[PDB]
Unconditional design. Structure first.
Lengths: 527, 203, 194, 195, 176, 162
């Protein structure tokens, strides 16, 4: 085709749509379109212009990179992809949204006055953690059926389905011995035995002589609906309860499909037709999850060899190895032992090259593993430890703890901490045994909407990064890796699972199939 | 039709479309002839050499002609976007042989615009409405052109016994004669056939 | 050129424009009525609202409830459209504050004719003569108040007259920019603020 | 009275005559739709009560809620349509790719409508001639000179003039270029026409 | 319609220039021009005349009506008459602006010409003000404005037409 | 009363009656607190200010000229009259009750009436302070943040009455 007419028509095609091409962009475009004639040229131009406009364009002027991506997408090249299909997101990479009350909308921080998060936070940020936790739970609470009736919704007035809400500052006043007060607030043992409630407006004593408590494991720093009456600067509790939990369908139906989970997608990955198709392109799309994988033990390494033997047929897309990787985490000794662990793991992986090229391997280190273990979100394992594994197994990613894994349209959260024991020791009211403890824990986590519903000295967190620990909206998987007990539970279209601790589960572990969201037990105890 | 008179007719249509309240009858012959004239002249100057005075003068005239054509089509598109259900209904109702208010390109644009607007309203709010109220007709919602608007004009072909209708009182009506070259300020509804037939120029 | 233009007000016509923000705000203004038959369940708003009750409710709602048989309610004029204020307008239209006497004076008055009051002709003549009286001052102020504070001039004008004032000011500013040559420059749009 | 929440949408748009686009009032839209839902449920209950029981005094309040519902519909539809008018003006006054500070104000469906409108407009512009169409978005003012002198306001990238010839738009650099090439960048504020 | 567009139409008017360059006949779409011979008068449209004067390629000659005696007679006739008198050009204000702003050096007594044109403009805009006021006061159905120019109509016509639309709807709102 | 504010003598430092003190929206007890860092920086500022009496009266970044500020104040005064938003008024109501209870309990603990009172005038003072803050921005309504800044300023003026 004539280069001058091809250039003129391509420039005109972009110009009529209001787009300007730089010299490199138009040159590359003419080279890419040189093999096409008038039977296809204009349709090709319209298609690639649509591909350009789909991208996050910041200006009418187009660099060569944008048209490169557009024409490559027009030429496919996304067949059997891993990008857009499987992402591991570090906790520091999660977008920092903030809920604005006047707009009643989540805004990204670039659209606000909020500063960037950093470890050495201000005195304000320490309060901002709990203030934002209250804010998210507050906007969650007021959208429940407890909301006031509409305009003459009932001929007699109703008290918000008998669940009308108030804050602490409102009842510090004329409302003495009002028998129907309900307040959202944080439980605190602000004096020993003399518990208090707190919200962003103020504080008040809790007379919890009767608790009448709904199922859930109550601790200090838990936010609760305290139902009771007020007298003598004391809130006399009639009942305690958590705020009701939302499904992600409800949350995204209200706020739209914002990508709260993070990752490359601008929208929530749960709503995408192409990604819905790519999720099911492999009927046995599959992942494996383990924890406390003590590779400083020869026994763990040999049993891992047997597990690779067992999953040579139908290998996963990725193996997920949660942390506390060591029998003996005790410093320099374990730095060298983890180097040896990863050398031996690379040897084993090269002894199964089919699994090496078929599966990825990701690591979520625990609080006891070497490095900045004790404060969350933990950074990844030290790069000097990983370096040989980086070059010998490029099909692997050491990442933060917690980390967010996305597989196509589904949301997986991975977090290593022995939190059930922490929660039950910081318990305010010993729960009823009729519901199992992992169900109590999962209900508490989902209702509190946070991975660490405990005081800061119980769960040390970098203050400005506390949003990364937030469970909101509810994901597809809560992979809470914990010594306590391997388990599987579910609520609000999530499956909340624990792979246990591999040396103490008798070397049992978990398997997950996102194509049908099923979970299977690797019951390989005699392996 | 010599090209000078073609440009003159283009400018006449430009002024009439500026000042008429409704969308006037289309002039596809004028648009196509001016477009091919611009293409031909641009090709000729592409053959000519640079740093040449006559080339620059021809380019300046091309700029003027293209400005008139672009402004005229922009005004027609403004009227189409403003009165899309009414122009589409008029095209639906149009008898055979009666001149169309839309070119084929303008008709396609109007149909696409109406479909886009209806789908937008549906998706945003009108599927959330109660079941009986989910449908609203844009033929009623969008206002019609105001044909009673007052316009200045200058006549080019003499007319007689043009009825001037002051208000609803019929007995206040009278008639006037529009002499050649005279200028008048009058309602558009009393002079719509005249401007359509080219007897008058709106100014 | 292709600048944004609001849906024009159709308040003076036989029926107001559906999509006009000005017409919507105009019709929101309240109108005294007398209810002709008791209405159940509406006692929460003004359980039944009893027969013969005096009410002030929006003009859109009065038009909706009003049937020409006068079955549900009877519609009464606001004070500014009754004979005394019509006489006030007849005295000197230039001094009355139509911004304070309802910002959509002419539009509200024109739609007030829909209820078929016996003094519809008087209302129409009063509106016409008020506009005729105020036209010359509107014209001169709009077309001669160049590059100054127009607050005192535009204060006493209703929204229709304010639109006419802005039209005249726009024409004046356009001609002055032309005469001083500033019209020839190509410039960025108002959206450069962003 | 019922309607006041719908009036806040109307008053929001009426308080900005300059044509700039406010942030989409999603919460207000949700509230007026919820109000319409409640009104419709009450109206259905009352009307079936009246018709089944033969009770005649309900009909005035049935008409009351019916008119209130139609009012709510008129207000929200007018709000959306006027927002569409403001959005449609952006393609001509600024250009195709809106700045992100403004794009953040638009709803997703508003961006859908805007993209459909842009595709329709570009299709219409292409169809005006045999090849390359006519870009009627250009030539917004009558032409005075064939070349103009322009000054770079924004530090900006390379700008092609014709094929191998291009100019670097560094800030405060000043070029003498064709008007039709510089019109879009002047309208976008990258360049300042001088003299 | 903007004043720049009225100027664009005014720029089509023919004026005479004396080139300082040689160029054969050029065949423009609106009509052929030339040949351009050095030192000899040639008639061209006003946009080309102004462009060549800006590029230092010609001397502009004033129109026959840009004469102080003729303009004084026209001004006195305009002030004496009540109706708009026939003007020397249909775009006299725009012609005056362009020619005097770009070629005051060529045109002698440009101050007097500009002041007399301004006098005529003031008188005729005053007449148009009186006509608009009489229209609205007497509730006329139409007016006759034979000798008005396009710039004069464009300066005040948008306001006048909008006001008359409002007046028409006000006086016709009792149609049943 | 004693020249400098003497913290040992407490309310005796004020001789103004409660009736006239109630009429002041805001009361500052601006104490001069000695501190070496503030004193050094203040002295440097003063000396540079005295040196800057010769430098052409140049303007400063992030600042409005006195004449422009004066005209802006006049414009905002004549143009904008704000009001309180409903939820903002609710917040101010609750905070007023807490403040009044604190003042009453302080007076009871001292067994002596405080010199500076806290009354409905102080409530309306907070209201009009919030409205002034809104009028700076030409906003028709005072937000919860405007009321928060008004409360902060009045809390500075109320610590000065503790």
């Amino acid at each position: 085709m004539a280069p001058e007419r091809l250039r003129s028509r391509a420039l005109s095609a972009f110009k009529l749509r209001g787009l300007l091409l730089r010299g490199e962009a138009i040159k590359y475009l003419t080279e890419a379109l040189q093999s096409i004639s008038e039977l296809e040229l204009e349709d090709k131009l319209e298609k690639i212009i649509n591909a350009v406009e789909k991208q996050p364009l910041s200006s009418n002027m187009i660099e060569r990179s944008v048209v490169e991506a557009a024409v490559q997408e027009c030429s496919q090249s996304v067949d059997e992809t891993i990008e857009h299909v499987f992402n591991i997101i570090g906790a520091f990479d999660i977008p920092r949204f903030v809920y604005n009350s006047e707009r009643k909308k989540f805004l990204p921080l670039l659209m606000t006055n909020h500063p960037a998060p950093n470890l050495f936070g201000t005195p304000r940020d320490k309060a901002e953690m709990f203030r934002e936790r209250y804010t998210i739970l507050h906007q969650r609470t007021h959208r429940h059926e407890l909301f006031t009736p509409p305009v003459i919704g009932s001929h007699p007035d109703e008290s918000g389905s008998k669940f009308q809400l108030k804050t602490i500052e409102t009842l510090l006043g004329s409302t003495t011995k009002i028998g129907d007060a309900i307040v959202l607030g944080m439980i605190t043992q602000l004096k020993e035995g003399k518990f208090f409630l707190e919200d962003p407006t103020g504080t008040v004593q809790l007379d919890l002589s009767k608790a009448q408590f709904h199922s859930g494991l109550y601790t200090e720093a838990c936010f609760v609906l305290a139902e009771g009456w007020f007298e003598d600067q004391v809130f006399h509790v009639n009942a305690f309860g958590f705020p009701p939990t939302e499904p992600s369908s409800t949350t995204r139906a209200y706020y739209g499909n914002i990508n709260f989970f993070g990752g490359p997608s601008n929208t929530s990955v749960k709503t995408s037709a192409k990604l819905k198709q790519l999720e099911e392109e492999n009927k046995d799309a599959m992942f494996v999850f383990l924890s406390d994988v003590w590779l400083d033990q020869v026994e763990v390494l040999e049993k891992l060899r047997i597990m690779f033997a067992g999953y040579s047929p139908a290998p996963p897309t990725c193996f997920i190895l949660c942390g506390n990787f060591s029998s003996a985490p005790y410093g320099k000794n374990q730095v060298q032992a983890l180097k040896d662990s990863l050398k031996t793991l690379a040897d084993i992986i090269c002894e199964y090259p089919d699994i090496h090229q078929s599966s990825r391997f990701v690591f979520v280190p625990g609080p006891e593993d070497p490095g900045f273990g004790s404060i969350l979100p933990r950074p990844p394992l030290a790069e000097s430890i990983t370096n040989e594994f980086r070059q010998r197994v490029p099909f692997s990613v050491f990442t933060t703890n917690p980390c967010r894994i996305q597989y196509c349209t589904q949301e997986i959260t991975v977090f290593r901490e022995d939190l059930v024991n922490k929660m039950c020791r910081n318990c305010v009211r010993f729960p009823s045994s009729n519901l199992a403890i992992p169900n109590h824990f999962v209900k508490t986590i989902l209702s509190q909407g946070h991975l660490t519903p405990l005081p800061l000295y119980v769960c040390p967190v970098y203050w400005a990064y506390d949003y990364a620990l937030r469970v909101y909206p509810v994901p597809d998987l809560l992979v809470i890796a914990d010594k306590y007990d391997p388990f599987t539970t579910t609520n609000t279209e999530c499956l909340c699972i624990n792979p246990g601790s591999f040396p103490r589960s008798g070397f049992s572990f978990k398997v997950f199939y996102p194509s049908n969201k099923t979970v299977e037990d690797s019951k390989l105890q005699g392996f | 039709l010599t090209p000078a008179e073609l440009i003159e007719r283009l400018e006449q249509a430009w002024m009439n479309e500026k000042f008429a309240p409704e969308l006037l009858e289309s002039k596809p012959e004028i648009v196509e002839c001016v477009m091919e004239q611009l293409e031909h002249m641009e090709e000729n100057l592409r053959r000519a050499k640079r740093e040449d005075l006559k080339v620059s003068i021809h380019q300046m005239e091309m700029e003027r002609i293209r400005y008139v054509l672009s402004s005229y089509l922009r005004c027609r598109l403004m009227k189409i976007e403003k009165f899309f259900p009414h122009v589409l209904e008029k095209e639906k109702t149009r008898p055979e042989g009666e001149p169309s208010s839309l070119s084929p390109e303008e008709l396609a644009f109007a149909r696409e615009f109406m479909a886009n607007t209806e789908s937008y309203l549906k998706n945003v709010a009108l599927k959330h409405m109660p079941p009986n109220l989910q449908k609203v007709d844009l033929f009623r919602a969008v206002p019609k052109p105001d044909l009673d608007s007052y316009v200045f004009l200058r006549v080019r072909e003499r007319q007689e016994n043009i009825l001037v209708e002051p208000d609803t009182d019929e007995q206040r009506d009278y008639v006037i004669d529009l002499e050649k070259g005279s200028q008048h300020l009058i309602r558009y509804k009393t002079i719509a056939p005249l401007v359509a037939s080219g007897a008058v120029q709106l100014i | 050129s292709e600048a944004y233009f609001r849906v024009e007000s159709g308040a003076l016509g036989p029926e107001e424009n559906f999509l006009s923000l000005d017409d919507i705000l105009m019709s929101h203004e309240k109108l005294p009525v007398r209810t002709e038959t008791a209405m159940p369940r509406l006692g929460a708003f003004f359980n039944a609202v009893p027969q013969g009750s005096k009410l002030e409710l929006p003009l859109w709602l009065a038009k909706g409830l009003f049937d020409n048989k006068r079955r549900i309610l009877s519609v009464e004029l606001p004070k500014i459209y009754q004979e005394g204020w019509r006489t006030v307008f007849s005295a000197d239209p230039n001094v009355v504050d139509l911004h304070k006497m309802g910002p959509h004076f002419y539009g509200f008055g024109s739609q007030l004719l829909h209820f078929d009051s016996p003094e519809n002709a008087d209302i129409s003549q009063s509106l016409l003569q008020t506009f005729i009286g105020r036209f010359r001052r509107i014209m001169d102020s709009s077309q001669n108040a160049y590059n100054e504070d127009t607050s005192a001039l535009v204060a006493r004008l209703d929204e229709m007259e304010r639109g006419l004032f802005q039209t005249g000011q726009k024409g004046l500013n356009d001609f002055q920019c032309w005469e001083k040559g500033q019209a020839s420059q190509i410039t960025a749009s108002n959206l450069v603020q962003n | 009275m019922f309607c006041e929440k719908a009036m806040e949408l109307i008053r929001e748009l009426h308080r900005a005559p300059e044509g700039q686009l406010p942030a989409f009032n999603e919460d207000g839209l949700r509230q007026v739709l919820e109000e319409m839902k409640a009104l419709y449920e009450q109206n259905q209950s009352d009307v079936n009560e009246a018709k089944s029981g033969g009770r005649s005094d309900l009909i005035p309040t049935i008409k009351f809620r019916h008119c209130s519902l139609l009012r709510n519909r008129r207000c929200t539809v007018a709000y959306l349509y006027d927002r569409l008018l403001r959005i449609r003006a952006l393609r001509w006054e600024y250009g195709s790719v809106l700045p992100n500070a403004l794009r953040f104000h638009m709803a997703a469906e508003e961006m859908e409508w805007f993209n459909n409108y842009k595709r329709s407009l570009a299709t219409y512009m292409r169809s005006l001639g045999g090849d390359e169409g006519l870009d009627i978005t250009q030539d917004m003012k009558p032409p005075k000179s064939l070349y103009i002198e322009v000054r770079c306001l924004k530090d900006y990238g390379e700008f092609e003039v014709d094929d191998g010839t291009s100019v670097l738009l560094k800030k405060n650099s000043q070029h003498f270029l064709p008007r039709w090439k510089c019109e879009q960048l002047i309208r976008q504020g990258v360049l300042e026409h001088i003299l | 319609m903007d004043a720049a567009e009225v100027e664009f139409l005014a720029e089509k008017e023919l004026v005479t220039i004396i080139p300082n360059f040689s160029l054969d006949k050029i065949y423009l779409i609106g009509g052929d021009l030339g040949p351009f011979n050095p030192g000899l008068p040639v008639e061209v449209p006003l946009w080309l005349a102004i462009n060549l004067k800006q590029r230092q390629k010609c001397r502009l000659l004033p129109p026959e009506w840009m004469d102080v005696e003729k303009l004084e007679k026209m001004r006195d006739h305009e002030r004496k008459e009540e109706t708009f008198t026939p003007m020397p050009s249909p775009y006299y204000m725009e012609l005056t602006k362009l020619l005097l702003n770009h070629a005051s050096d060529n045109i002698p007594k440009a101050d007097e010409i500009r002041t007399l044109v301004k006098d005529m403009w003031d008188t005729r805009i005053a007449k148009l003000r009186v006509s608009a006021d009489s229209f609205v006061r007497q509730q006329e159905a139409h007016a006759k404005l034979d000798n008005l120019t396009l710039m004069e109509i464009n300066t005040s016509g948008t306001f006048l037409t909008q006001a008359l639309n409002h007046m028409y709807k006000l006086r016709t709102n009792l149609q049943p | 009363v004693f020249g400098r504010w003497d913290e040992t003598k407490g309310e005796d430092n004020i001789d103004f009656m409660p009736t006239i003190l109630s009429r002041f929206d805001m009361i500052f007890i601006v104490k001069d607190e000695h501190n070496e860092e503030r004193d050094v920086m203040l002295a440097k500022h003063v000396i540079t200010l005295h040196v800057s009496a010769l430098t052409q009266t140049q303007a400063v970044e992030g600042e409005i000229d006195l004449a422009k500020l004066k005209k802006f104040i006049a414009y905002c005064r004549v143009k904008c009259g704000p009001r309180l938003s409903a939820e903002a008024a609710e917040k101010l109501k609750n905070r007023y009750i807490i403040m009044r209870s604190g003042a009453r309990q302080h007076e009871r603990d001292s067994d002596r009436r405080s010199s500076i009172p806290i009354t409905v005038r102080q409530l309306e003072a907070i209201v009009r302070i919030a409205e002034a803050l809104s009028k700076m921005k030409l906003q028709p309504f005072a937000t919860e943040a405007d009321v928060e800044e008004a409360l902060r300023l009045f809390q500075v003026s109320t610590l000065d009455a503790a």
